[PDB]
Design a protein around this motif. Structure first.
Motif, PDB file in Angstrom:
ATOM      1  N   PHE F  60       0.813  -1.206   0.000  1.00  0.00           N
ATOM      2  CA  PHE F  60       0.000   0.000   0.000  1.00  0.00           C
ATOM      3  C   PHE F  60       0.848   1.258   0.000  1.00  0.00           C
ATOM      4  N   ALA F  72      -9.689  -1.549  -5.984  1.00  0.00           N
ATOM      5  CA  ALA F  72     -10.024  -2.730  -5.199  1.00  0.00           C
ATOM      6  C   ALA F  72      -9.926  -2.441  -3.705  1.00  0.00           C
ATOM      7  N   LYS F  78     -11.688  -3.945   2.432  1.00  0.00           N
ATOM      8  CA  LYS F  78     -10.879  -4.477   1.348  1.00  0.00           C
ATOM      9  C   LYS F  78      -9.408  -4.528   1.733  1.00  0.00           C
ATOM     10  N   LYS F  81      -9.321  -7.759   3.428  1.00  0.00           N
ATOM     11  CA  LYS F  81      -9.343  -8.792   2.411  1.00  0.00           C
ATOM     12  C   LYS F  81      -8.042  -8.857   1.627  1.00  0.00           C
ATOM     13  N   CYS F  82      -7.286  -7.760   1.575  1.00  0.00           N
ATOM     14  CA  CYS F  82      -5.909  -7.820   1.106  1.00  0.00           C
ATOM     15  C   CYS F  82      -5.039  -8.599   2.071  1.00  0.00           C
ATOM     16  N   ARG F  84      -5.748 -10.847   4.260  1.00  0.00           N
ATOM     17  CA  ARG F  84      -5.945 -12.287   4.231  1.00  0.00           C
ATOM     18  C   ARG F  84      -5.545 -12.898   2.898  1.00  0.00           C
ATOM     19  N   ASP F  85      -5.565 -12.122   1.807  1.00  0.00           N
ATOM     20  CA  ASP F  85      -5.220 -12.671   0.498  1.00  0.00           C
ATOM     21  C   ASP F  85      -3.744 -13.028   0.417  1.00  0.00           C
ATOM     22  N   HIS F  88      -3.083 -16.041   2.601  1.00  0.00           N
ATOM     23  CA  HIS F  88      -3.291 -17.279   1.861  1.00  0.00           C
ATOM     24  C   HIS F  88      -2.083 -17.629   1.007  1.00  0.00           C
ATOM     25  N   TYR F 117      -7.844 -12.323 -10.929  1.00  0.00           N
ATOM     26  CA  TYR F 117      -7.293 -10.985 -10.867  1.00  0.00           C
ATOM     27  C   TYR F 117      -7.595 -10.191 -12.120  1.00  0.00           C
ATOM     28  N   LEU F 122      -7.809  -7.095  -9.741  1.00  0.00           N
ATOM     29  CA  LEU F 122      -6.743  -7.055  -8.758  1.00  0.00           C
ATOM     30  C   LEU F 122      -5.393  -7.050  -9.469  1.00  0.00           C
ATOM     31  N   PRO F 123      -4.518  -6.112  -9.143  1.00  0.00           N
ATOM     32  CA  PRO F 123      -3.208  -6.084  -9.798  1.00  0.00           C
ATOM     33  C   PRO F 123      -2.316  -7.186  -9.272  1.00  0.00           C
ATOM     34  N   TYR F 127       0.414  -7.875  -5.975  1.00  0.00           N
ATOM     35  CA  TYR F 127       0.661  -9.101  -5.229  1.00  0.00           C
ATOM     36  C   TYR F 127       2.134  -9.484  -5.231  1.00  0.00           C
TER      37      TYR F 127
HETATM   38  C1  LIG Z   1      -6.889 -20.739  -0.913  1.00  0.00           C
HETATM   39  C2  LIG Z   1      -6.227 -19.693  -1.362  1.00  0.00           C
HETATM   40  C3  LIG Z   1      -6.824 -18.337  -1.425  1.00  0.00           C
HETATM   41  C4  LIG Z   1      -6.288 -17.166  -2.111  1.00  0.00           C
HETATM   42  C5  LIG Z   1      -5.050 -16.968  -2.934  1.00  0.00           C
HETATM   43  C6  LIG Z   1      -7.123 -15.971  -1.976  1.00  0.00           C
HETATM   44  C7  LIG Z   1      -7.588 -15.538  -3.353  1.00  0.00           C
HETATM   45  C8  LIG Z   1      -8.852 -14.732  -3.253  1.00  0.00           C
HETATM   46  N1  LIG Z   1      -8.918 -13.395  -3.090  1.00  0.00           N
HETATM   47  C9  LIG Z   1     -10.202 -13.031  -3.064  1.00  0.00           C
HETATM   48  C10 LIG Z   1     -10.591 -11.620  -2.866  1.00  0.00           C
HETATM   49  C11 LIG Z   1      -9.790 -10.408  -2.605  1.00  0.00           C
HETATM   50  N2  LIG Z   1      -8.433 -10.384  -2.535  1.00  0.00           N
HETATM   51  C12 LIG Z   1      -8.147  -9.069  -2.324  1.00  0.00           C
HETATM   52  C13 LIG Z   1      -6.751  -8.625  -2.159  1.00  0.00           C
HETATM   53  C14 LIG Z   1      -6.168  -7.644  -2.867  1.00  0.00           C
HETATM   54  N3  LIG Z   1      -6.737  -6.967  -3.852  1.00  0.00           N
HETATM   55  C15 LIG Z   1      -5.897  -6.094  -4.389  1.00  0.00           C
HETATM   56  O1  LIG Z   1      -6.152  -5.324  -5.294  1.00  0.00           O
HETATM   57  C16 LIG Z   1      -4.554  -6.164  -3.741  1.00  0.00           C
HETATM   58  C17 LIG Z   1      -3.527  -6.629  -4.759  1.00  0.00           C
HETATM   59  C18 LIG Z   1      -4.763  -7.188  -2.641  1.00  0.00           C
HETATM   60  C19 LIG Z   1      -4.644  -6.530  -1.275  1.00  0.00           C
HETATM   61  C20 LIG Z   1      -3.199  -6.146  -1.035  1.00  0.00           C
HETATM   62  C21 LIG Z   1      -9.331  -8.174  -2.194  1.00  0.00           C
HETATM   63  C22 LIG Z   1      -9.422  -6.691  -1.938  1.00  0.00           C
HETATM   64  C23 LIG Z   1     -10.450  -9.098  -2.404  1.00  0.00           C
HETATM   65  C24 LIG Z   1     -11.920  -8.778  -2.422  1.00  0.00           C
HETATM   66  C25 LIG Z   1     -12.273  -8.216  -3.793  1.00  0.00           C
HETATM   67  C26 LIG Z   1     -13.161  -9.186  -4.526  1.00  0.00           C
HETATM   68  O2  LIG Z   1     -12.674 -10.276  -4.890  1.00  0.00           O
HETATM   69  O3  LIG Z   1     -14.347  -8.860  -4.741  1.00  0.00           O
HETATM   70  C27 LIG Z   1     -11.145 -14.165  -3.190  1.00  0.00           C
HETATM   71  C28 LIG Z   1     -12.656 -14.180  -3.217  1.00  0.00           C
HETATM   72  C29 LIG Z   1     -13.266 -13.696  -1.909  1.00  0.00           C
HETATM   73  C30 LIG Z   1     -13.817 -12.305  -2.110  1.00  0.00           C
HETATM   74  O4  LIG Z   1     -14.323 -12.016  -3.215  1.00  0.00           O
HETATM   75  O5  LIG Z   1     -13.730 -11.491  -1.168  1.00  0.00           O
HETATM   76  C31 LIG Z   1     -10.224 -15.307  -3.338  1.00  0.00           C
HETATM   77  C32 LIG Z   1     -10.587 -16.751  -3.513  1.00  0.00           C
HETATM   78  N4  LIG Z   1      -8.250 -16.439  -1.138  1.00  0.00           N
HETATM   79  C33 LIG Z   1      -8.061 -17.749  -0.849  1.00  0.00           C
HETATM   80  O6  LIG Z   1      -8.894 -18.407  -0.127  1.00  0.00           O
END
Ligand SMILES: C=CC1=C(C)[C@@H](Cc2[nH]c(/C=C3N=C(/C=C4\NC(=O)[C@H](C)[C@H]4CC)C(C)=C\3CCC(=O)O)c(CCC(=O)O)c2C)NC1=O
Ligand SMILES: C=CC1=C(C)[C@@H](Cc2[nH]c(/C=C3N=C(/C=C4\NC(=O)[C@H](C)[C@H]4CC)C(C)=C\3CCC(=O)O)c(CCC(=O)O)c2C)NC1=O
Ligand SMILES: C=CC1=C(C)[C@@H](Cc2[nH]c(/C=C3N=C(/C=C4\NC(=O)[C@H](C)[C@H]4CC)C(C)=C\3CCC(=O)O)c(CCC(=O)O)c2C)NC1=O
Ligand SMILES: C=CC1=C(C)[C@@H](Cc2[nH]c(/C=C3N=C(/C=C4\NC(=O)[C@H](C)[C@H]4CC)C(C)=C\3CCC(=O)O)c(CCC(=O)O)c2C)NC1=O
Ligand SMILES: C=CC1=C(C)[C@@H](Cc2[nH]c(/C=C3N=C(/C=C4\NC(=O)[C@H](C)[C@H]4CC)C(C)=C\3CCC(=O)O)c(CCC(=O)O)c2C)NC1=O
Ligand SMILES: C=CC1=C(C)[C@@H](Cc2[nH]c(/C=C3N=C(/C=C4\NC(=O)[C@H](C)[C@H]4CC)C(C)=C\3CCC(=O)O)c(CCC(=O)O)c2C)NC1=O
Ligand SMILES: C=CC1=C(C)[C@@H](Cc2[nH]c(/C=C3N=C(/C=C4\NC(=O)[C@H](C)[C@H]4CC)C(C)=C\3CCC(=O)O)c(CCC(=O)O)c2C)NC1=O
Ligand SMILES: C=CC1=C(C)[C@@H](Cc2[nH]c(/C=C3N=C(/C=C4\NC(=O)[C@H](C)[C@H]4CC)C(C)=C\3CCC(=O)O)c(CCC(=O)O)c2C)NC1=O
Ligand SMILES: C=CC1=C(C)[C@@H](Cc2[nH]c(/C=C3N=C(/C=C4\NC(=O)[C@H](C)[C@H]4CC)C(C)=C\3CCC(=O)O)c(CCC(=O)O)c2C)NC1=O
Ligand SMILES: C=CC1=C(C)[C@@H](Cc2[nH]c(/C=C3N=C(/C=C4\NC(=O)[C@H](C)[C@H]4CC)C(C)=C\3CCC(=O)O)c(CCC(=O)O)c2C)NC1=O
Ligand SMILES: C=CC1=C(C)[C@@H](Cc2[nH]c(/C=C3N=C(/C=C4\NC(=O)[C@H](C)[C@H]4CC)C(C)=C\3CCC(=O)O)c(CCC(=O)O)c2C)NC1=O
Ligand SMILES: C=CC1=C(C)[C@@H](Cc2[nH]c(/C=C3N=C(/C=C4\NC(=O)[C@H](C)[C@H]4CC)C(C)=C\3CCC(=O)O)c(CCC(=O)O)c2C)NC1=O
Ligand SMILES: C=CC1=C(C)[C@@H](Cc2[nH]c(/C=C3N=C(/C=C4\NC(=O)[C@H](C)[C@H]4CC)C(C)=C\3CCC(=O)O)c(CCC(=O)O)c2C)NC1=O
Ligand SMILES: CCC1=C(C)[C@@H](CC2=N/C(=C\c3[nH]c(C[C@@H]4NC(=O)C(C)=C4CC)c(C)c3CCC(=O)O)C(CCC(=O)O)=C2C)NC1=O
Lengths: 164, 238, 177, 164, 164, 164, 177
Positions: F60, F72, F78, F81-82, F84-85, F88, F117, F122-123, F127
């Motif tokens: 960020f 995003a 969000k 959700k970043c 946790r992404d 993961h 992505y 999502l960029p 990531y």
């Molecule tokens: C098992 C393995 C596993 C993964 C690899 C991740 C992958 C993943 N990410 C998201 C979902 C997401 N992931 C991000 C993260 C980001 N967005 C950005 O632009 C940045 C690059 C980054 C934060 C730094 C965000 C903001 C969402 C919610 C946006 C969306 O999907 O609607 C979702 C759907 C859930 C949702 O829609 O909220 C999934 C499956 N989750 C998992 O369960």
């Protein structure tokens, strides 16, 4: 080419197997036949032209409409082309009559009968009505007996079967 | 709903449609296969098209290897089984080109009829890899590229997956190799009548089934039909 | 498809004689720097994506004649096809690298290949330019001799390992020519 | 099943053609060989056991090493399993001797001869040396003549051919 | 050719993947076995001929019937062809002993063992009885220890496994 | 699932061959790397949350535009959700860090990175810029040495390689 | 298809939590006797041909009802088919043995299998009899507890290794049932 040998050695071919005592017994029936199945060749080696000219006008008798305009056998030159067309037919019957199959028929007689009478408007009904009239001319008088006369029928009949 | 007859966890395949329809499906697929086998042997000869074996073992080992491959279709996950039903409908409608309102609703009621139909239609329409004969050295290379590309279905991310298990004894390994180039030699063996028409048969098959567009790459297929024949993009997982 | 162990064994079948106790000592010299080779080829897969990204960008910058219409890398599908034709080189030479033996090239990629490239009208000089980029990418990457990439390995020599990979792209530039 | 009819009607089957006068001539050779090719069945319907017990010890005579330890036919129960094994062989020879093919052989005699003597260490050389010793016991004295005695040879010989 | 590298780089090949840190760890076990797995080559680089001539007559001792007529090893020239045949076998064992696989065996030793002893009537039982007698000659006295002597056994044994 | 054993026994499977001394040598390298390749699991079993929260705000920091509207990572949920992404991501890195492959990555990390992505905007640049900032935190001080610390890099790097 | 290393890692994805420093110590206990396992499974492929030769001969001797006409191993092709159906068990359980993990069974052989055996009318009791032969073949072969086979290995315990293979044929007899 559809002789019994063309069946059985290609069977062991597409098997890839040895030419064992599977394929050996196939030929001797054709060999035993050489007393019967090819003796119906000489009876129209005496009657080449003398059967198609009496079958073709019989076809023209049951189908007198052929000589109209708008038909195939309108004038006499199409009548000659009729008289050679059935000549080709029982010609190939006398061909398959000495092979052990209908190979000359299955390559040259009835294979590709699909559009040659469809696009050219030739009635295959008229063809089989001409050549079925040749069939009841088989009798033990003045032919040889039904040991050999029947293979003629057995080879013209498949011509009916895929023409009609 | 305690102790219910129905079970939450088990394994449906999809497409079950009742017990009596399973004897229906394999038999429709059987006579479709007989209709296909009445074409290349389709005058009275058994051409080198079918070519069951080449030696002592190559007869009856190709039996049990094929039976093994038929078993490997049975023991799949419900995911790929469902997926195979799903692609089978969409490919079986791309078989004759016409939506035959009876014969389309066969192949979306039925799948091994549909699968057997696609296979037997690819066999009589000699558009297959085992009937290709690439003359160009450029053609063999790209044929190889398509072959490597196919493995990506079998090998999704790095492991072989029992979809090219190819026979399971010490002997069953080696017999598939010699049975390969036994038939691969027979691709250049038959006649000038056939195997000039194979170049046009892949020109009937790959240009419209799988690639509706990609005209710059469809001109590759019309340039190199031997590579376009070995594309094999029906997902037989092989 | 064939490796450095069995590279001498086809030659040992070529005499139909027994392998010695001496002829396999070259395998010991090959074998001591095996962990060196694994300290090397991980750096060959270190930034292989950046390597090919570097490669076609560094090939297109002295020759943007491919970006002209009719030039072989004008179309983005042709550009991704160029990436695809390029990345398998990074595959195949490193298959030979971990083989210690150039066998994976001639059976998987080299045959029928320049025939396709003249069949597709592919300019061969652009490909030898791209693979000569790779030949100096690889020896820089096995060492720490990169600008920002410091793949720190156990110290010492990889000129044996550099001469290994330099003995690989030469056949690539040769067989595509 | 490898009779002449299994060849010719499957030929017209995979043809999809009519059962024309291609396949008709195939059977009558087998029919004429019902005077010859199956008359060699009764000569070992008189000698069931009386040929395998004199062939098997002859095999054990040329191969006396079989009765050693570390072999197959070490003790007498493996000798009985030898004496039934060759019994199965010329049993199936007498089977194919009445079919018009080697169908019982090609399903049950020599198909699957690949590992049953490879893994079980049985010398197929010993099998063919046992059954070739049965072959020179064909003579016009005390059999019927070579019109019928030769089909025995013609059916044991393919057993040699795929065993050896 | 069946070395560990022939497995792992063809694995990434038919993967089409990058040669990542999947395939890297494969070689160093073979590298550490360059202290062990190829040190059993020099013990029969001292004993080339001196093991097959004492194994082959042992095979002829347990199988004395070989020197009869109607066999393979009847006279002394077939005995020489025996003595080179097993020479080829443990030759290829010493070959695969330095590769990291049984590539020389799997192309040249046991692949194609199907008819070369079936049609030529050679007992593969006699071959494995000859080469298993070579197996119990492994001992820590006058060889090197079981760090290195066991890979000889580990390479002759697959020759047993696909020969027998 | 992409362990070395999943390669080599499926190799002998699709071979149909015996599990000979081809596949045996594969496991002991992973066994010797149980001293090294899985010892980088406990260092983030101490730092579960303490690395992703310092990598994500660094992402960020280099990408402050994420918190705008029309992006995003606009608001704080969000941002969670970043957080946790990427959790993961290096979660699955620590998963593949103990398997002998990237099986958890190749089924669950980077397989299916195509539209998740692309459609969700999502960029993947963001990531890999987050997780490459985790990479230079490997050092022999306060980790264990480069015998074990490097396999962390060797497993996050393929995540870069198929994400970027 | 899956191994003992990644056996715990699907469970570690099942929590979506990090692997510890403690949970992988079971891999160390698995890992010290790795050379024991390789001193074992070579003896599993020691006389595997004699093992299956022993197996179907020792299965047919208490039940020669298969040698009756209509019995499943009367025909020599059915006998070789029985050998073929048997030898893959020796393959698959030892794939699981070197895996240290029972994953190769359920994806390559166990599914759809007893359905074929009841589809082919294969007597399942003969197969559980043959595989129970194998369960005591294997523990005798990993030790030196054979009649003439003395596969002398480095001395000590293989009861861990015996309990491993005894934890494999049980699933074989279970899934064919
Ligand atoms: C098992 C393995 C596993 C993964 C690899 C991740 C992958 C993943 N990410 C998201 C979902 C997401 N992931 C991000 C993260 C980001 N967005 C950005 O632009 C940045 C690059 C980054 C934060 C730094 C965000 C903001 C969402 C919610 C946006 C969306 O999907 O609607 C979702 C759907 C859930 C949702 O829609 O909220 C999934 C499956 N989750 C998992 O369960
Ligand atoms: C080798 C085997 C062989 C054959 C089987 C015949 C088949 C055959 N018939 C015709 C051609 C013909 N065949 C007929 C015959 C008839 N039309 C009818 O309506 C009647 C049923 C019948 C007369 C009784 C006629 C009239 C033509 C000429 C019409 C046409 O085809 O344009 C032609 C093309 C030649 C032409 O167009 O004139 C061929 C190949 N010829 C062969 O060489
Ligand atoms: C039990 C039903 C059933 C089928 C009919 C077949 C499907 C089928 N149709 C055809 C054969 C054909 N199939 C069609 C297709 C059609 N015809 C039309 O006019 C419609 C628009 C469309 C759907 C009926 C056509 C035009 C032919 C003849 C030309 C050809 O061979 O393609 C063939 C090749 C054999 C032949 O040439 O006759 C086969 C296998 N399979 C089956 O299981
Ligand atoms: C007249 C109709 C007719 C056919 C269609 C074939 C059908 C057929 N194919 C194979 C055998 C084979 N057939 C194919 C062909 C294919 N596999 C695919 O996945 C593609 C759909 C397709 C062409 C690319 C291949 C690749 C093999 C060898 C391995 C296998 O059985 O799949 C065999 C076993 C004998 C052999 O050919 O070796 C048979 C009978 N034969 C026939 O007589
Ligand atoms: C199957 C394995 C495989 C190979 C052995 C190579 C070789 C190869 N290249 C192309 C095909 C090609 N390869 C290139 C690549 C290039 N052209 C240039 O001028 C540059 C030197 C270079 C990029 C840097 C291009 C541009 C095409 C044609 C794509 C097109 O024009 O649409 C093809 C045809 C289809 C395909 O891509 O597979 C093959 C087999 N690529 C492969 O995929
Ligand atoms: C030797 C002959 C030969 C061809 C004719 C092409 C055909 C082709 N292209 C792609 C590969 C592709 N195919 C498409 C599909 C298309 N691309 C477009 O520009 C159109 C929209 C549409 C035309 C059909 C796309 C978008 C890709 C790239 C992504 C993908 O692999 O699916 C694939 C899938 C396998 C792969 O390459 O990954 C195939 C079979 N490739 C070949 O090797
Ligand atoms: C014509 C246009 C043009 C370009 C696009 C650039 C691209 C470029 N870089 C290098 C040269 C190199 N390229 C790399 C590769 C990399 N270096 C890194 O820091 C990354 C990890 C990785 C992907 C970028 C390495 C390691 C070297 C040698 C030393 C160095 O510069 O790092 C070379 C020479 C080939 C070689 O010596 O290996 C070229 C052509 N330069 C140009 O002249
Ligand atoms: C499977 C995974 C795997 C690895 C990642 C490596 C890891 C590794 N690398 C080296 C060891 C080494 N690696 C290198 C290589 C280099 N040193 C440099 O300074 C350059 C940057 C680079 C040139 C390419 C050198 C020179 C040694 C020391 C070996 C020696 O000097 O003999 C060693 C010491 C053992 C030995 O070499 O004998 C180990 C375990 N080995 C493996 O088995
Ligand atoms: C339907 C057709 C049919 C056959 C062709 C035979 C084939 C056959 N032979 C044996 C089995 C055998 N066959 C022999 C015979 C011999 N071993 C030798 O080394 C000598 C060459 C020869 C005696 C002269 C012996 C000794 C066995 C038992 C050895 C064994 O298979 O374990 C078996 C398995 C039964 C068993 O193991 O005991 C079968 C199916 N049996 C049949 O039912
Ligand atoms: C590259 C690897 C390689 C091999 C594995 C062998 C395999 C081999 N053996 C023989 C050939 C032979 N091998 C033997 C040996 C024996 N016969 C027996 O019954 C005993 C079991 C054993 C002696 C103890 C004999 C006697 C011949 C000659 C018999 C023959 O094949 O005609 C031949 C053909 C040459 C010939 O016919 O003489 C070949 C290729 N040779 C090789 O070049
Ligand atoms: C009913 C008829 C009948 C037979 C044919 C024999 C066969 C036979 N052997 C064993 C028993 C065994 N069989 C083997 C297998 C072998 N042992 C070796 O020395 C060789 C390497 C290998 C192939 C022979 C082993 C290792 C044992 C247990 C201990 C032993 O006897 O060696 C068993 C019991 C099963 C078991 O305990 O595993 C049977 C039925 N015994 C019989 O009662
Ligand atoms: C493809 C992988 C594969 C398997 C998972 C197993 C399972 C299996 N068994 C059979 C088929 C069979 N399996 C057996 C074996 C036996 N029946 C018995 O009563 C005994 C218990 C046992 C021998 C000891 C028999 C007798 C057949 C049928 C063969 C026949 O009757 O002709 C088949 C059908 C064709 C084939 O052999 O492949 C399959 C898939 N065998 C395999 O090849
Ligand atoms: C890849 C090829 C390969 C091999 C063949 C083995 C070879 C081998 N086995 C053992 C070592 C051993 N092997 C065994 C196994 C047994 N001992 C017995 O008395 C029983 C007969 C049998 C039960 C199955 C035991 C008990 C040890 C000693 C290990 C220990 O006691 O901790 C060791 C010592 C190293 C160690 O165990 O830590 C080695 C190198 N290892 C390999 O890497
Ligand atoms: C389901 C796994 C499986 C098969 C497929 C077949 C494969 C096969 N066909 C055979 C032999 C064979 N091959 C053909 C010709 C062949 N038959 C045709 O219908 C067409 C179109 C053909 C061209 C190749 C005939 C007519 C026979 C003899 C009867 C038969 O076995 O089918 C033989 C043995 C040789 C022999 O019978 O003597 C086998 C093993 N068997 C199997 O176990």
């Amino acid at each position: 080419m559809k002789s019994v040998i063309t069946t059985v050695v290609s069977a062991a071919d597409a098997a890839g197997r040895f030419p064992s005592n599977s394929d050996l017994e196939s030929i001797q029936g054709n060999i035993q036949r050489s007393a019967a199945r090819l003796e119906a060749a000489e009876k129209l080696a005496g009657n080449h032209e003398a059967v198609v000219k009496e079958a073709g006008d019989a076809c023209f008798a049951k189908y007198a409409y052929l000589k109209n305009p708008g038909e195939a056998g309108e004038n006499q030159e199409k009548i000659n082309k009729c008289y050679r067309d059935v000549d080709h037919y029982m010609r190939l019957v006398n061909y398959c009559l000495v092979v052990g199959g209908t190979g000359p028929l299955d390559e040259w007689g009835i294979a590709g009968a699909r559009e040659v009478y469809r696009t050219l408007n030739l009635p295959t009904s008229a063809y089989v009505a001409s050549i079925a009239y040749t069939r009841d001319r088989l009798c033990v008088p003045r032919d040889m007996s039904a040991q050999a006369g029947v293979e003629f029928s057995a080879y013209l009949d498949y011509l009916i079967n895929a023409l009609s | 709903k305690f102790l219910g007859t129905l079970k939450r966890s088990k394994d449906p395949s999809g497409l079950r449609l009742g017990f009596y329809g399973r004897k229906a499906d394999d038999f429709m697929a059987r006579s479709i296969a007989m209709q296909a086998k009445a074409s290349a042997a389709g005058s009275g000869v058994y051409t080198t098209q079918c070519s069951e074996g080449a030696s002592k073992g190559m007869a009856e080992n190709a039996r049990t290897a094929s039976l093994a491959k038929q078993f490997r279709q049975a023991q799949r996950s419900a995911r790929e089984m469902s997926f195979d039903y799903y692609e089978g409908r969409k490919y079986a409608m791309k078989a004759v080109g016409h939506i035959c309102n009876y014969e389309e609703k066969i192949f979306q009621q039925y799948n091994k009829t549909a699968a057997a139909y696609v296979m037997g239609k690819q066999e009589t329409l000699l558009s297959c890899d085992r009937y290709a004969q690439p003359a160009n050295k450029a053609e063999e290379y790209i044929q190889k590229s398509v072959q490597m590309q196919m493995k990506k279905r079998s090998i999704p991310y790095g492991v072989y997956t029992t979809s090219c298990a190819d026979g399971t004894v010490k002997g069953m390994a080696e017999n598939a190799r010699v049975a390969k180039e036994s038939a691969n030699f027979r691709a250049r063996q038959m006649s000038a009548g056939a195997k000039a028409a194979a170049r046009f048969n892949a020109r009937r098959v790959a240009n419209d089934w799988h690639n509706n567009g990609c005209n710059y790459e469809e001109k590759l297929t019309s340039r190199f039909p031997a590579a376009a024949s070995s594309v094999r993009p029906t997902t037989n997982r092989y | 498809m064939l490796d450095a162990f069995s590279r001498v064994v086809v030659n040992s079948d070529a005499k139909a004689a027994y392998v010695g106790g001496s002829d396999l000592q070259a395998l010991k010299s090959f074998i001591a720097d095996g962990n060196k080779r694994l300290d090397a080829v991980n750096s060959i897969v270190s930034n292989a994506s950046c390597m090919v990204s570097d490669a076609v960008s560094g090939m297109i910058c002295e020759n943007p004649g491919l970006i002209s219409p009719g030039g072989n890398c004008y179309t983005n599908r042709r550009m991704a096809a160029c990436l695809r034709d390029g990345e398998i080189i990074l595959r195949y030479v490193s298959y030979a690298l971990l083989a210690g033996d150039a066998s994976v090239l001639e059976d998987r990629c080299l045959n029928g290949l320049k025939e396709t490239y003249i069949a597709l009208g592919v300019p061969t000089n652009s490909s030898i330019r791209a693979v000569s980029i790779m030949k100096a990418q690889a020896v820089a990457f096995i060492t720490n001799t990169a600008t920002e990439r410091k793949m720190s390995f156990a110290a010492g020599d990889c000129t044996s390992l550099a001469s290994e990979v330099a003995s690989y792209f030469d056949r690539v530039g040769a067989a595509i020519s």
